[PDB]
Amino acid sequence: RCCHPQCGAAYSCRK
């Protein structure tokens, strides 16, 4: 998962 600010819009909090 990547729900951090390092991924931004391209995060993976859930979907």
Strands in the chain per DSSP E:
none
Euclidean distance between CA atoms 15 and 7, whole angstroms: 13
1, 13 Cβ separation under 8 angstroms = yes
13, 5 Cβ separation under 8 angstroms = no
What kind of experiment solved this structure?
NMR
For residue 1, what are its two tokens?
A: 């998962």
Among the listed residues 3, 4, 6, 5, the one whose alpha carbon sits nearest the alpha carbon of residue 15: 3
Could you count the other beta carbons within 10 Å of the beta carbon of residue 11? Answer: 14
Euclidean distance between CA atoms 15 and 3, whole angstroms: 10
Cα pseudo-dihedral 6, 10, 8, 11, rounded to 10: -70
**Residue 14 CA, distance from chain mean position:** 8
